[model samples]
Target: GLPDVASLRQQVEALQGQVQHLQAAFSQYKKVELFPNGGI
Candidate 1:
C-alpha cells in the first residue's frame, strides 16, 4: 500500500541536484558598474 518511499525520494533528490548543478554552470562571471568600485 505504498509507492516505495525510499526509491521515490532518491529519484527526486537526484533531479534536484542536477538542477542545482545546471544553475551553477550557467552563472554570470562579472559586470561593469557605473560607480567603478563593483557591481553585478
Candidate 2:
C-alpha cells in the first residue's frame, strides 16, 4: 500500500525548505572565497 497523501506532502515541503536554505548558504559562501590561498 502507498503512504498517506498528507504525509508525502509534508515531506516534500520540508525538503523544499531545506533545499532553499542550502542554496542561500552556498551563494553566501561563494562570495567569500575564504580559502583561496589553499585552492579551495
Candidate 3:
C-alpha cells in the first residue's frame, strides 16, 4: 500500500475547493443575453 495516496487525495480535495470558489466568483456577474433569436 502506498502512503502517498492519502496525500494525493487531500491535494485533489483542495483543488476542488478552489474550483468551487472560482466558479462562484465567476457567476457573480450577470451576463447579458444578446441576440436571443439570432438577432432577428
Candidate 4:
C-alpha cells in the first residue's frame, strides 16, 4: 500500500517500450546467413 506502486509500474512500462524500440531499430537490417543458395 506504499512505495508509489503506480509510478513504479509506469517506469517499468516506459523501460519496456524503450527495449521494444531498440529491438525494432536493430531489426531494420536483416542478419546474413552462412549459406543461402547452398541450402540442402
TM-scores for all predictions: 0.52, 0.59, 0.57, 0.58
The digit string of per-residue lDDT tens for model 4 on 1-40 reads 5667888898999999999988887675445353457647
**Per-residue lDDT of 1-40 in model 1, one digit per residue for the tens?**
2667788898999999998887766563223333465556
- After superposition, candidate 4 runs with Cα above 4 Å error: 1-3, 29-40
User: What's the lDDT for residue 37 in model 3?
Assistant: 58
Clashes of 2: 0
Model number with the top TM-score:
2
lDDT of every model, 2 decimals: 0.70, 0.85, 0.77, 0.77
Error of model 2, residue 6, in angstroms = 2.1
Report the lDDT of model 2 for residue 34.
Answer: 63
Q: Give the better candidate number (2 or 3) by TM-score.
A: 2
On TM-score, the stronger of 2 and 4 is: 2
Instruction: Rank candidates by TM-score, best first.
Output: 2, 4, 3, 1
CA-RMSD of model 3? 3.8
| Candidate 4 clash pair list | none
TM-score of candidate 2 on Cα atoms, chains taken together? 0.59
lDDT of each residue in 1-40, candidate 3, tens digit only: 4778888998999999999988887775425354345644
Worst 10 residues of 3 by lDDT: 28-37
